[PDB]
Amino acid sequence: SRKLILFIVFLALLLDNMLLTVVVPIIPSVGLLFASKATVQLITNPFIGLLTNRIGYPIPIFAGFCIMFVSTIMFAFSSSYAFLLIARSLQGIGSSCSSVAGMGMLASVYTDDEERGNVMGIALGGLAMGVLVGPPFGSVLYEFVGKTAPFLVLAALVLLDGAIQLFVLQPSRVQPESQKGTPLTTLLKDPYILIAAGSICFANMGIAMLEPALPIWMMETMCSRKWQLGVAFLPASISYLIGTNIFGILAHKMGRWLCALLGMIIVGVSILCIPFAKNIYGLIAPNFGVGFAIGMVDSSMMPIMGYLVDLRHVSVYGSVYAIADVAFCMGYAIGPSAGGAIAKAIGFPWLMTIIGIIDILFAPLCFFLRSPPA
Numbered sequence: 226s227r228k229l230i231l232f233i234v235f236l237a238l239l240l241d242n243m244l245l246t247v248v249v250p251i252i253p254s255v256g257l258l259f260a261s262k263a264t265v266q267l268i269t270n271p272f273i274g275l276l277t278n279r280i281g282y283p284i285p286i287f288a289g290f291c292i293m294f295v296s297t298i299m300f301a302f303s304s305s306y307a308f309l310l311i312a313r314s315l316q317g318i319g320s321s322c323s324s325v326a327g328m329g330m331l332a333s334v335y336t337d338d339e340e341r342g343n344v345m346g347i348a349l350g351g352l353a354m355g356v357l358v359g360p361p362f363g364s365v366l367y368e369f370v371g372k373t374a375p376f377l378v379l380a381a382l383v384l385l386d387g388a389i390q391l392f393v394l395q396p397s398r399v400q401p402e403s404q405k406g407t408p409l410t411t412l413l414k415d416p417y418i419l420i421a422a423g424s425i426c427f428a429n430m431g432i433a434m435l436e437p438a439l440p441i442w443m444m445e446t447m448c449s450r451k452w453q454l455g456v457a458f459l460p461a462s463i464s465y466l467i468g469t470n471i472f473g474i475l476a477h478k479m480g481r482w483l484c485a486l487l488g489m490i491i492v493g494v495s496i497l498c499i500p501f502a503k504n505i506y507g508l509i510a511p512n513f514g515v516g517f518a519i520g521m522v523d524s525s526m527m528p529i530m531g532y533l534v535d536l537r538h539v540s541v542y543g544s545v546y547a548i549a550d551v552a553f554c555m556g557y558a559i560g561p562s563a564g565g566a567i568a569k570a571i572g573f574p575w576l577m578t579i580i581g582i583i584d585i586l587f588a589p590l591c592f593f594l595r596s597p598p599a
């Protein structure tokens with residue numbers, strides 16, 4: 226059925242993101258390792274995009290379990306920096322495979338735009354939920370048992386997920402797609418695919434510049450307590466969960482172009498409002514708005530990728546969702562380091578204001594998605 230595939234993609238994304246996050250609080254126990262996974266995923270996304278059109282979705286969505294499970298074990302038994310880096314790179318390839326192949330399969334199964342909206346919303350809700358229950362899970366287990374409890378529990382969990390894969394997807398038989406998909410070059414030459422991918426990129430780059438540089442600006446102006454840095458962003462996750470689980474539904478009613486436009490403005494007018502907050506209490510509302518609007522944008526531009534592909538090019542979703550994932554991961558690849566560097570160069574408030582201005586100025590470019598020609 227289709228709901229089984231939806232649940233399998235949801236659980237895959239959830240477990241992959243629990244892993245990306247769980248590792249965060251264990252690494253201090255600092256260089257390019259934090260972005261190794263993201264940049265490796267950015268490298269290996271288009272390859273899965275072209276591979277899903279050559280061998281099918283199952284085999285390259287099941288290769289997620291076989292690879293992420295190896296990472297979750299390699300992290301469980303990591304001693305040197307080289308082992309940690311190769312484990313994070315293997316995770317990155319696993320997250321690629323899972324995200325690209327799973328979103329492509331969700332697009333190829335739910336062939337109606339209205340239902341594809343809700344399905345992509347639910348999958349991104351899986352992403353958000355995994356990110357939300359990640360740091361808790363890891364820490365709790367790290368403090369109560371040791372540095373190997375979270376990784377072994379997630380190994381068991383991805384093993385169960387891979388069993389569901391083997392007994393639902395049946396990747397035993399290779400199966401090429403029905404028609405030759407449009408080459409990635411032509412897809413990237415289109416203006417509307419570029420606009421949607423750019424919207425997702427800019428939104429996620431704003432978040433990924435905010436997150437690892439807000440504790441820095443906090444410990445020097447607010448003098449917040451140690452645990453305050455943890456709650457300083459939990460509103461963003463919770464709001465992203467809410468937004469990307471409800472707007473996958475609300476967007477096709479409101480109009481995906483309008484949802485994305487309003488989505489980015491809200492991102493802009495919230496990120497711009499972060500530097501004006503002086504105390505942790507005043508930091509909540511703009512962070513909530515940031516998360517809510519990032520969800521507004523993501524759940525509304527993820528269906529529109531497959532929609533534009535169905536409306537303009539041939540109906541093969543591997544390459545276009547590889548493009549959208551590249552958009553995503555560009556943020557968590559470049560944004561953290563570049564934002565830290567810019568904050569050290571000019572200043573964190575000016576960096577957040579630049580991000581906000583760029584987002585508010587780029588938002589009106591989403592009106593071009595009101596009615597694209599065929």
Ligand SMILES: COc1cc2c(cc1OC)[C@H]1C[C@@H](OC(=O)[C@@H](N)C(C)C)[C@H](CC(C)C)CN1CC2
Pocket residue numbers: 242245246247248249259263352353356432436461462463465515516519520553557
């Ligand atoms: C390991 O270290 C990290 C820890 C964390 C992150 C990245 C890290 O490294 C990369 C991101 C993940 C975000 O979101 C996501 O992954 C998802 N949106 C998907 C679409 C990428 C999240 C955005 C929402 C609050 C709006 C913010 N943080 C949470 C913790």
